Design a protein around this ligand. Structure first.
Ligand SMILES: COCCOCc1nn(C)c2c1CSCc1cc(n(C)n1)CCc1cc(c3ccc(F)cc3c1)OCCCc1c(C(=O)O)n(C)c3c-2c(Cl)ccc13
Ligand SMILES: OC[C@H]1O[C@H](O[C@H]2[C@H](O)[C@@H](O)[C@@H](O)O[C@@H]2CO)[C@H](O)[C@@H](O)[C@@H]1O
Length: 517
């Protein structure tokens, strides 16, 4: 139901120092009498947006910064307004990671990058290249060991290799070009082909997950793993003689890990926002607060300058920041969730042999592009229907598909508006859409109606065609400013409800083919 006033509920991932965070919670309770409950639910990054949308969930959510732009866009996060004195205590680049549309939407905690972790008793010198790992595995298999095991179920761990020879998520030049996705280029293919060849040649197993890789490294059965600072605690307990070092190069180029800033957001529906701010600023983001978490599971390079100066002498942190420098700080754009879902499926299907590398990355490209391509088509159709004049701007990336989808939608959507004028006029009058607040109300009812019953291109045409019908109404009553929000809302409904179906149709190319006369 509603978040309980007078306590704090905190969500953090089960691989992080949640017992250390609970100790900070106990210090908070000692001062204030306010009880702090720390939970680590499974899939909390997927659960948070579901429960927070209903005004429920934790007061504070911890995740890497990449997921907070989506949460902020969805209205699920309170704006963070620390004073200059507090802001100056953290590195400016960490605040940049938690800025979305010019507003701070979380507190940055620590910088995370993957490193190569190696067993000095099996491999005194780690391999500098991915290319030498097959030969090393052959040497180690003769000793009853293997070279490398890491999580193949989460694309976070394979991304550094995919990115090495030129794979990218969203092109960054000067600003992100969200229309420019680098998932199915020659560089991405080269990296994922290398991983699949390691599996084909029995150097790795497609079924290896976080738990299997951690157990094999910590038992001394595999010489190397790929993991973040949080993993170091369990390796210390195992008494493995380990090193943390630069990831291997691929085709002479560095592995490029996607760099995360562990961040703490405040639930927009929390009645405990002042308690949450007090906890995060004056208990957690202190030398003693971060020490308590770091002693449980290491954070990496903490955002708090005073404590980072103390930790920076650690060679494992130096290695973390060397890999971070060769990588890229993740975007926080709302499309990151879709990007990760698309690439997760691609790596798992390529690794298992369900798809070829070409097939897998083609689907991942379509899934990653789906929101922005859908919005380009739907925004243009609604606006030209409302105003009577087309947009002269270039379509940009995958422009032929956008142009031909808009041409098709002009033919079939104009026909739907003509033939279903009665139902459209009746429903427009019942909805009584007057302003941007009324447009924002449509999402819930649209999802309900559209998600029920059969999936086909005709119902997608009806969804967008009624959008155009509403947009014409909005322009006429001098609410033209409502049209882009309406287009965004319809696009969100379409892509969230029909993601998997749309990718199976080759997205908008399927639409053009389906309605080809
Ligand atoms: C006077 O005669 C009566 C006969 O009428 C029967 C009929 N025939 N037709 C064609 C539709 C209907 C009503 S029953 C479906 C319905 C629609 C709504 N409610 C509450 N119920 C309003 C909530 C809503 C739903 C939207 C919206 C999309 C863009 C937008 F800007 C605002 C939207 C608001 O999209 C749902 C999926 C697309 C859709 C479909 C579909 O999926 O097939 N149908 C059948 C629609 C009908 C209408 Cl009028 C509008 C849209 C659809
Ligand atoms: O695998 C995709 C996944 O990558 C990142 O998640 C990391 C997280 O940042 C780390 O702190 C650690 O918990 O491992 C996770 C990988 O299992 C992204 O932050 C996440 O959004 C994305 O889904």
């Amino acid at each position: 139901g509603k978040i309980e006033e007078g306590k704090l509920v905190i969500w953090i991932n089960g691989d992080k120092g949640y017992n250390g965070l609970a100790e900070v919670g106990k210090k908070f309770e000692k001062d204030t009498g306010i009880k702090v409950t720390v939970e680590h639910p499974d899939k909390l990054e997927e659960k948070f947006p579901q429960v927070a949308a209903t005004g429920d969930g934790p007061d504070i959510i911890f995740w890497a910064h990449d997921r907070f732009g989506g949460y902020a866009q969805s209205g699920l996060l309170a704006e963070i307004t620390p004073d200059k004195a507090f802001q100056d205590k953290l590195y400016p680049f960490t605040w940049d990671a938690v800025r979305y549309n010019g507003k701070l939407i979380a507190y940055p905690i620590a910088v995370e990058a993957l490193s190569l972790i190696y067993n000095k008793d099996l491999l005194p010198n780690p391999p500098k290249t991915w290319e030498e790992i097959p030969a090393l595995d052959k040497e180690l298999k003769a000793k009853g060991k293997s070279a490398l095991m890491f999580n193949l179920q989460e694309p976070y761990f394979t991304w550094p290799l995919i990115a090495a020879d030129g794979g990218y998520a969203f092109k960054y030049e000067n600003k992100y070009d969200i229309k420019d996705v680098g998932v199915d280029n020659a560089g991405a293919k080269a990296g994922l082909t290398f991983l699949v060849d390691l599996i084909k040649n029995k150097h790795m197993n497609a079924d290896t997950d976080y738990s299997i890789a951690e157990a094999a490294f910590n038992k001394g059965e595999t010489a190397m793993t790929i993991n973040g600072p949080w993993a170091w605690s369990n390796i210390d307990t195992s008494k493995v003689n380990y090193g943390v070092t630069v990831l291997p190069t691929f085709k002479g180029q560095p592995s490029k890990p996607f760099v995360g800033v562990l961040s703490a957001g405040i639930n927009a529906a929390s009645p405990n926002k002042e308690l949450a701010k007090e906890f995060l600023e004056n208990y957690l983001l202190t030398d003693e607060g971060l020490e308590a978490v770091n002693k449980d599971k290491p954070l990496g390079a903490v955002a708090l300058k005073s404590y980072e100066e103390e930790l920076a002498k650690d060679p494992r942190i130096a290695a973390t920041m060397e890999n971070a420098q060769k990588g890229e700080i993740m975007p926080n754009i709302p499309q990151m969730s879709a990007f990760w879902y698309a690439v997760r499926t691609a790596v798992i299907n390529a690794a298992s042999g369900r798809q070829t590398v070409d097939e897998a990355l083609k689907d991942a490209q379509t899934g990653s592009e789906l929101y922005r391509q859908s919005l380009e088509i739907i925004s243009r159709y609604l606006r030209e229907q409302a105003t009577g004049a087309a947009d002269t701007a270039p379509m940009g990336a995958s422009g032929a598909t956008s142009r031909k989808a808009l041409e098709t939608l002009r033919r079939v959507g104009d026909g739907v508006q003509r033939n279903h004028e009665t139902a459209f006029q009746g429903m427009l009058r019942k909805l009584d859409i007057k302003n941007e607040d009324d447009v924002k109300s449509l999402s819930r009812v649209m999802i309900h109606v559209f998600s029920d019953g059969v999936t086909n291109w005709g119902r997608i045409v009806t969804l967008i065609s009624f959008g155009a019908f509403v947009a014409k109404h909005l322009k006429t009553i001098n609410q033209e400013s409502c049209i882009e929000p309406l287009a965004e809302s319809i696009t969100d409904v379409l892509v969230r409800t029909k993601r998997d179906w749309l990718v199976k149709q080759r997205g908008w190319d399927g639409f053009v083919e389906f309605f080809h006369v």
